[PDB]
Write a protein that binds this DNA or RNA. Sequence first.
DNA 1: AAAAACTATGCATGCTCTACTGCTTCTGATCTAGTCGACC
Length: 66
Amino acid sequence: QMHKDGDVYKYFSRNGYNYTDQFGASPTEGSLTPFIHNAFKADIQICILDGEMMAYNPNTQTFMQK
DNA sequence: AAAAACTATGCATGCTCTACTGCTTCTGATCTAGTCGACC
């Protein structure tokens, strides 16, 4: 689950453990936020999303199971 | 002319540096096996 507050990101796992370090808290650092920041709209300052994280291989252009 | 005093020297001891070689032990780098956390 990802919480976006302006320029602040907070990633939490299924059990509530803080994963923001791995995925990043700000666009300047991380593995997902620096690249997915541009995908958000201008009129979205507060947002909460719940989803799944996978490993996308671009050579096959497909997701790889755990 | 004859006896005594001073100097040359020289060989041996112990110390000191200086190095060389061997053994013992401490430190560091690397490899392998086991363990913990998160998830599903």
